Paper text:
To elucidate the mechanism of polymerase inhibition, we determined the structure of full-length Mtb [name] in complex with nargenicin and a DNA substrate by cryo-EM. The structure was determined to a resolution of 2.9 Å with well-defined density for the polymerase active site, DNA, and the bound nargenicin molecule. The cryo-EM structure of Mtb [name] is identical to the previously determined crystal structure with the exception of the oligonucleotide/oligosaccharide binding (OB) domain that was not included in the crystal structure. The OB-domain is flexible as it shows a weaker density in the cryo-EM map when compared to the rest of the molecule. The DNA is bound in a canonical manner between the thumb and fingers domains, as was previously observed for other C-family DNA polymerases. The nargenicin molecule is bound in the polymerase active site and is sandwiched between the last base pair of the DNA duplex, the first base of the [name] strand, and the fingers domain of the polymerase. Nargenicin occupies both the position of the incoming nucleotide as well as the [name] base and thus mimics the position of the newly synthesized base pair. To do so, the first unpaired [name] base is displaced from its position and bumps into Pro668 of an adjacent helix (residues 668 to 673) that becomes disordered. On the protein side, nargenicin occupies a shallow pocket and only makes three direct contacts with the protein: Arg667 and His787 make a hydrogen bond to two oxygens in nargenicin, while Gln638 makes a hydrogen bond with the nitrogen in the pyrrole ring.
Residue numbers in the entry: 7 to 940, 964 to 1099
């Protein structure tokens, strides 16, 4: 009799329209001492999972419903239906005749199920624009355990009363009331202090009296506490796309839409309308628990097997067949024993079906010619896998362990992730759908969030319009660089305590000394941590043994009709649905293309299965550090390590991946491996006592602890641990729960003691392991990813030109990657030929010892334009001249834009016209010919300057191919430059000597030190080779204007030698 439950609230799932995050919201419900709360979002049930979980923990009853978007007529019909005369425009059916709101709440578990279904049918059958509409027809069929109200102002009853259609309003109420029932109909009354609500008040109370509808108070809250209303206003401007200054923008009137106290709400309503407040309590008593919806169940598909068999038996049979195929003349010793052990584990844990499903997917793919990758993650450690065809890496030779992948003692579920090539990953999703059902397979949702960089850009737009992007850019490009992907929080820039304060000085400078920047920043802080939009998970596919619609809410992406799921992946798996990960890889595609190029350019047919792992040529390449374009080995650091390591065998490759770990660089493990191997450093026993037990386990890695697998074996020998138990020890050591980690010492200590070890030795091993036990790599992953690295390297080493063509084709879109790769080709000696109209195809092509640029990779030119161009040439001649070109081409390819691009690229150079000439003539000529379609056009003799042509060519192609700037100026620099780049590289020059090098600048990189003062690093490449130059914070200020790519410069520097790297440190640029 003294409290109020709120039944109409909006969370942040009503995207860019609600502001109330669930944990803050439930904090307030507690402080105000209310029994229960409700959530009723706008045409979705996407946040039901988070809400149910949080309320149950914090002891509050959860009520879940939806605010539907109903349709004036049929859901299928997509014609706007206004209900009144033109003048009453702003008081009619909302969204210009599209929709009318309704409030629905789930009393029972049954009710919540029906509500999930109704929501799904709406996206499938009733989508108009961005609103998924139910209609009166749907709701009747699926209507048990739901409670409905006469609705907000934007609902039907109230819109009718506003326009004066009073009899019509009464008719609507009686319709909706019959659908649901006498007890499930309530009259909604809200007061916020405006007239539109007040005029109708008499109207509503009248209808209620006539039809005996009980009344209910609600407050339509979109935010938690009053101080926040300012923020709700900036949010609405993000959704609606209009500036704050603009008069006609959507807005709320006055800050009453918040979680009021019980006392506030009783005064406002208790005097005039008796019982509005008391009914809110009566509803809350009626709601029952929704636990059953969330109780976990077994819902994995069951694989069909031939007669006289079960899942177990068929697994055994398929394993046996696989062993024969791999080992034609008989399995080696012990292979049979490992298989039988593993099969029993899988069968005990009841996962036979899972393995068979994964196998079929790989087999179908192999038939169809889709490449599948060697292995990813932890799966390469199972023999059952290698036999079934899933994995192409043999467990037993390399020492990988089964317990890492599946642990006998623990209870969990296996996770296999599979890579398919980038282009044809799509077919796989479809095929899975075909095989298992269209109603049983779906993709999975992601919820996007606003972080620092996003919020700066939303704020600039709402304050300053579409012209605001330029300012937002300047601020965003002046933040300090990010540690993993995560970036400095917005609070951090201005708060002394936070660790990164020193780093952020530059941006703060602007905040304090510019009005506009300061205004953007203040709005931004409010817009952070809020959900912005829906998205779709990059790899996941959910599968079920039953129709998905009986378990979860679903939606259909409008563009392609794909089914997606309502809840996200942690949430789906919790109730027992199967997740599978199909990943895309682009390096798999490059491999396919280079094989095919050889078949045509030369005659060989190549099978990568039967290439030896010991090719001399591969290792010469890896050792010289020429690894641009090789999987995983691209970085500037990793190239230097490979130089020092000088690899000799496949084992050295598996290791280089795992030793550049975020720990090992600083924890200095990678310098050791290199030196121990090359006899510059001496192996060190951990302790004199323990040398001999642990000699073999650590011999491969020259005495260091590199792999997680090495750790599990150590525990076995010294402390006599079962490999299953050693597995638990690794995980616990990782998380560092101190109480457990303490207990861990007891077990380890006791075991080593019984074996007969000293107190001192026991202490030593523990001490060494803890540092090395958060930076230890999974060996299975490095073996699988090492193979792909080796294959890429072999193909580059034996067939140079054919490989580079496959590579350049894949990076057509990204013009920064293309620039890197095109310079590589030049140094290797390959000649890339300029694009051409008659002798080029869509993709780059290997023609003898050269490559011809692909037309599909010019800027602004698309697939469809080039497709048409080629057919014309096929059918109706070569293109003789520019005029002939204009005559023959169809309408689609006549665009002014396409034509100018090709002029600058050099596509018409063969035909013999000068480049500038075509450009000036192009505008008029296109029009004339296009007119006829719906000519001898003269070409002028003028040409752009060398520098400028190259600048423009770079724009369209990514780098210049026809010539190089230094060509033609190379001699000039030579006269003035005291020291050749080759000499200094060779080590001829004494350390710390003045020098005057000259060349072209490339790959300028911007860096900021701890105190925040910007500086730059660049490569001064000349005709042959280059030496790295560093311009320091002070240097960067005085001469910092000219440090931009592709500038011929003269640098005054100082020779600096360190750790086998020779570099220049410079002060003056002319
Ligand atoms: C969730 O975090 C990711 C980390 C990945 C991030 C960076 C690379 C990093 O580990 C990644 C990766 C995919 C790791 C796997 C262990 C995998 C687990 C779930 O199986 O994913 C992760 O752990 C990537 C790469 O494949 C391996 C070889 C690692 O690459 C390097 O460390 C590396 C350094 C230099 C070149 N490669
Ligand atoms: Zn709203
Ligand atoms: Zn509403
Ligand atoms: Zn509402």
């Amino acid at each position: 009799g003294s409290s109020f439950v709120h039944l109409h609230n909006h969370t942040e799932y009503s995207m860019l329209d609600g502001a109330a995050k669930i944990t803050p919201m439930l904090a307030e419900v507690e402080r105000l001492g209310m029994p229960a709360v409700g959530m009723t979002d706008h045409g979705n049930m996407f946040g039901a999972s988070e809400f149910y979980n949080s309320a149950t923990k914090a002891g509050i009853k959860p009520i879940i419903g939806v605010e539907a978007y109903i349709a004036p007529g049929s859901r299928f019909d997509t014609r706007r239906i206004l209900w009144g005369d033109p003048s009453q425009k702003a008081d009619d059916v909302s969204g210009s005749g599209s929709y009318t709101h309704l409030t629905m709440m789930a009393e029972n578990a049954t009710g919540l199920r029906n509500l999930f279904k109704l929501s799904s049918h709406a996206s499938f059958e009733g989508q108009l624009s961005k609103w998924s509409r139910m209609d009166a027809e749907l709701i009747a069929e699926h209507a048990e355990g739901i409670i409905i109200t006469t609705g907000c102002p934007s609902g039907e009853v109230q819109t009718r009363l506003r326009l004066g259609q009073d009899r019509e309003a009464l008719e609507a109420a009686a319709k909706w009331r019959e659908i649901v029932g006498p007890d499930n109909y309530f009259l909604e009354l809200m007061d916020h202090g405006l007239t539109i609500e007040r005029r109708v008040r008499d109207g509503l109370l009248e209808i209620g009296r006539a039809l005996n509808i009980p009344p209910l108070a609600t407050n339509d809250c979109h935010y938690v506490t009053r101080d926040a209303a300012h923020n709700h206003e900036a949010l609405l401007c993000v959704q609606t796309g209009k500036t704050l200054s603009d008069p006609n923008r959507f807005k709320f009137d006055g800050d009453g839409y918040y979680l009021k106290s019980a006392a506030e709400m009783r005064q406002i309503w208790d005097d005039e309308v008796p019982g509005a407040c008391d009914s809110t309590l009566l509803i809350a008593e009626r709601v029952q628990s929704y636990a059953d919806v969330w109780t976990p169940r077994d819902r994995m598909p069951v694989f069909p097997v031939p007669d006289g068999h079960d899942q177990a038996s068929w697994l055994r049979h398929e394993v046996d067949a696989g062993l024969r195929r791999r080992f034609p003349a008989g399995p080696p010793d012990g292979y049979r024993e490992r298989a039988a052990y593993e099969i029993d584990v899988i069968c005990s844990k009841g996962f036979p079906s899972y393995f068979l499903i994964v196998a079929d997917l790989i087999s179908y793919a192999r038939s169809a010619g889709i490449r599948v990758g060697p292995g990813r993650g932890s799966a390469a450690g199972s023999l059952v896998a290698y036999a079934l065809g899933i994995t192409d890496i043999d467990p037993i030779p390399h020492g990988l362990l089964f317990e890492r992948f599946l642990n006998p003692e623990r209870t969990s579920m296996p996770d296999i992730d599979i890579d398919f090539d980038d282009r044809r990953r799509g077919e796989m999703v479809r095929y899975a759908a075909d095989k298992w059902g269209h109603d049983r397979v779906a993709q999975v949702i992601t919820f996007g969030t606003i972080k620092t960089k996003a919020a700066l850009k939303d704020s600039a737009r709402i304050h300053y319009g579409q012209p605001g992007f330029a300012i937002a850019d300047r601020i965003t490009k002046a933040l300090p660089p990010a540690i993993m992907a995560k970036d400095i929080p917005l609070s951090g820039i201005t708060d002394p305590s936070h660790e990164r304060y020193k780093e952020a000085a530059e941006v703060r400078g602007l905040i304090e000394t510019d009005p506009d920047v300061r205004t953007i920043y203040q709005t931004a802080r409010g817009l952070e941590g809020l959900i912005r939009n829906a998205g779709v998970h990059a790899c996941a596919v959910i599968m079920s043994s039953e129709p998905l619609t009986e378990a979860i809410p679903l939606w259909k992406r409008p563009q392609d009709g794909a089914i997606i799921t309502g809840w996200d992946y942690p949430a789906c798996e919790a109730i027992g649905l199967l997740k599978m990960d199909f990943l895309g890889l682009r390096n798999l595609t490059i491999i396919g293309d280079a094989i095919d190029n050889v078949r045509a350019n030369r005659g060989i047919d190549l099978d990568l299965e039967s290439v030896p792992l010991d090719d001399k040529a591969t290792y010469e390449l890896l050792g010289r550090g020429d690894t641009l374009g090789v999987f995983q080995l691209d970085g500037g650091p990793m190239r230097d390590l490979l130089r020092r390591m000088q690899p000799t065998g496949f084992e050295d490759v598996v290791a280089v991946i795992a030793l550049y770990r975020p720990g090992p660089m600083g924890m200095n493990a990678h310098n050791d491996y290199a030196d121990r191997k090359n006899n510059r450093q001496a192996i060190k026993p951990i302790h004199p006592e323990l040398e001999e037990p642990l000699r073999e386990i650590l011999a491969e890695t020259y005495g260091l602890i590199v792999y997680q697998e090495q750790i599990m074996r150590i525990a076995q020998k010294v402390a006599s641990y079962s490999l299953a138990r050693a597995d638990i020890l690794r995980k616990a050591m990782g998380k560092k729960k101190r109480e457990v980690l303490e207990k861990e010492f007891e077990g380890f200590s006791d075991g080593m003691q019984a074996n007969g070890f000293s107190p001192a030795a026991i202490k030593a091993l523990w001490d060494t392991i803890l540092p090395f036990a958060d930076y230890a790599f999974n060996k299975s992953h490095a073996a699988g990813y090492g193979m792909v690295s080796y294959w890429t390297a072999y193909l580059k080493a034996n067939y140079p030109a054919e490989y580079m063509a496959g590579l350049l084709t894949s990076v057509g879109d990204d013009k920064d990657k293309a620039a890197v790769y095109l310079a590589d080709c030049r140094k290797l000696g390959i000649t890339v030929l300029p694009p051409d109209v008659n002798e080029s195809g869509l993709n780059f092509a290997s023609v003898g010892q050269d490559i011809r640029y692909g037309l599909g990779a010019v800027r602004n030119v698309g697939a469809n334009v080039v497709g048409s161009l080629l057919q014309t040439r096929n059918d109706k001649g070569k293109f003789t001249d520019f005029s002939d070109y204009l005559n023959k081409i169809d309408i689609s390819a006549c665009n002014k834009k396409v034509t100018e691009s090709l002029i600058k690229a050099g596509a018409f150079d063969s035909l013999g016209h000068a480049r500038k000439g075509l450009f000036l003539v192009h505008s008029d000529a296109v029009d004339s010919v296009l007119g006829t379609k719906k000519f001898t056009i003269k070409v002028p003799d003028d040409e752009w300057e060398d520098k400028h042509k190259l600048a423009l060519e770079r724009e369209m192609l990514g780098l210049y191919v026809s010539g190089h700037p230094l060509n033609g100026v190379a001699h000039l620099l030579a006269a003035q430059v005291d020291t050749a780049i080759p000499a200094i590289l060779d080590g001829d020059v004494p350390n710390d000597a003045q020098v005057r090098v000259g060349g072209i600048l490339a790959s300028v990189n911007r860096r900021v030190n701890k105190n925040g003062m910007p500086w730059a690093s660049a490569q001064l490449e000349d005709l042959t080779g280059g030496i790295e130059v560093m311009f320091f914070p002070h240097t960067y200020s005085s001469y910092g204007a000219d440090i931009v790519d592709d500038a011929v410069v003269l640098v005054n520097a100082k020779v600096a030698v360190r750790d086998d790297r020779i570099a220049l440190i410079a002060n003056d640029l002319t």
